[PDB]
């Protein structure tokens, strides 16, 4: 009963060939894709043969999201949902998850490209440099939904290591402060990639001084993965 | 002057088909491919064309790398260099780069599906739950090695986020020593992934109280990452 059977796979950073192999022939195989996310090129989206019932979900609820994959698999059709990057990383892969496994589903999850390292890549900076640091933090920045207590920017920016933030293109105004409470210099590097394989994208490098004016001076408001830390100097 | 030019490939964690699209097609018409490491499997190996010239390297020592490399393409020739994994993360591609650049090569660097994320992936964990976690911490136990500073495992270990170790896997004692001393509990949930979509894989669950045992038990000594943190449990 392969049909019961949900892939999650991961679509990479933008770039329409950053796609695993294997995730590329799914793609191609599927009756329904579910694209969640609009964090994904019109040109990944296009490979789906024809045919192929294409659906947005994101602005659709739980368990609406869950029956329509739940009836296209009883249906005997191949579903598989496209996260951007690897979703292992602000995915949201999990309440599905478990609803789909109690209707018996099974799941296969198809790693993929974070875009983390696709920034770091865009750049050319490796993110661990031995003697300087070994630790790479992904976490993002608080905004109007505040994140678990021991984990504020401030202090996961006191082991001074290379920090990766996700979703937080538009708060480089508390980047900053934090950075600058856990003391860091106001030299120290940032770099920030903007839509990272995209063609529109853009590298921006700065430091914890100008983020916010950076940001705001390229007009990155959005889809911008920002590393900041020393291994991102020279 | 493209053949003055290095790509860096990550090759994905395992298997054959995690590599995307686009390094798969380097090394496929790559002259001169240099696999440092012996965590690429012969079955990556064995896609490049029937000519190409094949080398190992990592018991190379630093400037002969880089002048082969260089000599190969004042040849003419298509080099390629095959991390596991995603480069950016304990990739050493650093150094090598600065050479390079000096001898005006051009680098260009193919993202990759980290092991990371190969492991969450076998395990069917996101590492990020809304409430619970939203930071992602990756880094490596000291052994001999000594690690900066402020990065030592237990001072990471007290935001209590989700902890992802990479080349630790004969360091279980230091690494539930470190996780008690910072409070976790001894209940934590950790999984080990080894060779993590290799044939050989194996997924083992356990705890932090556990850890040491299960790894001796399944005998994992080498390629195993290890998630520790609650967004393993269920
Ligand atoms: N191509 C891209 N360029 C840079 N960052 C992007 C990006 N796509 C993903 N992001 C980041 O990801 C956030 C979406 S959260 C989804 C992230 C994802 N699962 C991944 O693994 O990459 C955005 O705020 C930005 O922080
Ligand atoms: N398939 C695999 N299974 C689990 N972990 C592996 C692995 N391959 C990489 N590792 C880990 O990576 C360490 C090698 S350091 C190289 C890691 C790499 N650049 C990556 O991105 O995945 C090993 O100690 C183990 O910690």
Request: proline share 5%.
């Amino acid at each position: 009963g392969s049909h019961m059977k949900l892939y999650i796979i991961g679509a990479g950073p933008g770039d329409p060939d950053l796609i695993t192999v294997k995730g590329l022939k799914l793609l191609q195989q599927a009756d329904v894709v579910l694209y969640a996310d609009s964090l994904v090129s019109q040109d990944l989206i296009a490979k789906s043969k024809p045919g192929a019932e294409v659906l947005k979900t994101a602005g659709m609820h739980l368990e609406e999201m869950v029956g329509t994959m739940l009836d296209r698999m009883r249906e005997g059709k191949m579903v598989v949902r496209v996260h951007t990057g690897d979703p292992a990383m602000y995915g949201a892969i999990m309440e599905q998850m478990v609803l789909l496994k109690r209707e018996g589903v099974d799941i296969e999850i198809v790693p993929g490209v974070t875009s983390v390292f696709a920034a770091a890549a865009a750049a050319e900076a490796e993110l661990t440099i031995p003697d300087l640091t070994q630790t790479v933090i992904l976490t993002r920045a608080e905004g109007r939904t505040p994140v678990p207590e021991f984990e504020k920017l401030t202090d996961l920016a006191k082991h001074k290591c290379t920090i990766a933030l996700f979703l937080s293109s538009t708060l480089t105004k508390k980047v900053m402060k934090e950075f600058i409470n856990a003391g860091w210099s106001e030299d120290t590097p940032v770099v920030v990639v903007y839509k990272a394989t995209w063609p529109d994208e853009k590298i921006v490098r700065t430091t914890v001084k100008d983020l916010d004016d950076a940001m705001r001076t390229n007009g990155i408001r959005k889809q911008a993965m920002i590393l900041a830390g020393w291994a991102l100097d020279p």
